[PDB]
C-alpha cells in the first residue's frame, strides 16, 4: 500500500555567524527516520524512528559521511547561485532539495522525485519520466544545459531505482509494527459565549493518530459544508493531532445539529 521516499535537505546561509546551516531529514511514511544538523554540537545523523537504533553504526558513518560531504556542496552552490541571481553575500539565502523513490504497494516504484528550489521558488527539477529536466528561468536555466550534457539524469535514475528502494524496503520491514499505529479521535463539542444569540459550537478532535481526518456537521438532514470553521490539522505535540470545525446556532436552537468524525483509525 503506496509508501514514502524523501530527503528534504536545506543549507541556509548564515550572514553573521558565518557558515550556512544544513539539515537533512529522511521520511519514511509520513514518518521521520533520521535527521542530522550541522549546527548540533557534533553533527551526525541521529535515528528518529526508534527502530532505526536497530541499525548498525557502520550505517551511521557510512551515512554521516555522506552528510559531512553533502554539506560541502550546498555551500558551493549557494555562492554559484549568487552570481546568476546577482546578490550580495551579506544576505540570507535558502537552497532546498527534495528527492525520493515513489514507493509502490507490493514492491515496485512508480515515481521519481528530484527537485531543487532556490530562495523559496523551484529552481531546477527532474521530470516523471526520470530522464528530462524543467528549469524556471534563465539562470536556473544555465544549470540545465550544463547538467544536461554531463549526465545528471542518468546518475539519479540509477539511484532512484536502486540504492533507494533496497533501502526503503529495509526500513519498510524494519519498520512495520511502528509505522502501522494509529490513534482514535477523542472527540466532543462545546457551546460558546457567542453572537447575538447565535452560540458558536465546536467539534474537537483532540489528539488522533495520523493526520488524516475530516469532520462534518449535520443540520439534522444535511452536511453543512457549504458553511465555514474548522482548523488546519495542527500537531500537539506529543505525536498526535487536533482539529476543530464549527458552526453558528440559534439561541437554544439546538434543533437538530449533528457531526460525523472520519478517521480511519476509527469505524464511525
Amino acid at each position: 500500500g503506496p509508501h514514502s521516499m524523501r530527503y528534504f535537505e536545506t543549507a541556509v546561509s548564515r550572514p553573521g555567524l558565518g557558515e550556512p546551516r544544513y539539515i537533512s531529514v529522511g521520511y519514511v511514511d509520513n514518518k521521520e527516520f533520521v535527521r542530522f544538523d550541522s549546527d548540533a554540537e557534533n553533527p551526525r545523523y541521529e535515528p528518529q524512528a526508534p527502530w532505526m537504533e536497530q541499525e548498525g553504526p557502520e550505517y551511521w558513518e557510512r551515512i554521516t559521511q555522506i552528510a559531512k560531504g553533502q554539506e560541502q556542496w550546498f555551500r558551493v552552490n549557494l555562492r554559484t547561485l549568487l552570481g546568476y541571481y546577482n546578490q550580495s553575500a551579506g544576505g540570507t539565502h535558502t537552497l532546498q532539495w527534495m528527492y525520493g523513490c515513489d514507493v509502490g504497494s507490493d514492491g515496485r516504484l512508480l515515481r521519481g522525485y528530484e527537485q531543487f528550489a532556490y530562495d523559496g521558488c523551484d529552481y531546477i527539477a527532474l521530470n516523471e519520466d526520470l530522464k528530462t529536466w524543467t528549469a524556471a528561468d534563465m539562470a536556473a536555466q544555465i544549470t540545465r544545459r550544463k547538467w544536461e550534457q554531463a549526465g545528471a539524469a542518468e546518475y539519479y535514475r540509477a539511484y532512484l531505482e536502486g540504492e533507494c528502494v533496497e533501502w526503503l524496503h529495509r526500513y519498510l520491514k524494519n519498520g512495520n509494527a511502528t509505522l502501522l499505529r494509529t490513534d482514535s479521535p477523542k472527540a466532543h463539542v462545546t457551546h460558546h459565549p457567542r453572537s447575538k444569540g447565535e452560540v458558536t459550537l465546536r467539534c474537537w478532535a483532540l489528539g488522533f493518530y495520523p493526520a488524516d481526518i475530516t469532520l462534518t456537521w449535520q443540520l439534522n438532514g444535511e452536511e453543512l459544508t457549504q458553511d465555514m470553521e474548522l482548523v488546519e490539522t495542527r500537531p500537539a505535540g506529543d505525536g498526535t493531532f487536533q482539529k476543530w470545525a464549527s458552526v453558528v446556532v440559534p439561541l437554544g436552537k439546538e434543533q437538530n445539529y449533528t457531526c460525523r468524525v472520519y478517521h480511519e483509525g476509527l469505524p464511525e
Binding site: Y7, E9, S24, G26, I63, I66, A67, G69, Q70, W73, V76, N77, T80, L81, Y99, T143, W147, A150, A152, Y155, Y156, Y159, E163, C164, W167
Partner: peptide, 9 residues
Amino acid sequence: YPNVNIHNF
C-alpha cells in the same frame, strides 16, 4: 540512504 550530489550548479 541519501545520495552523493556530485555535480555542481
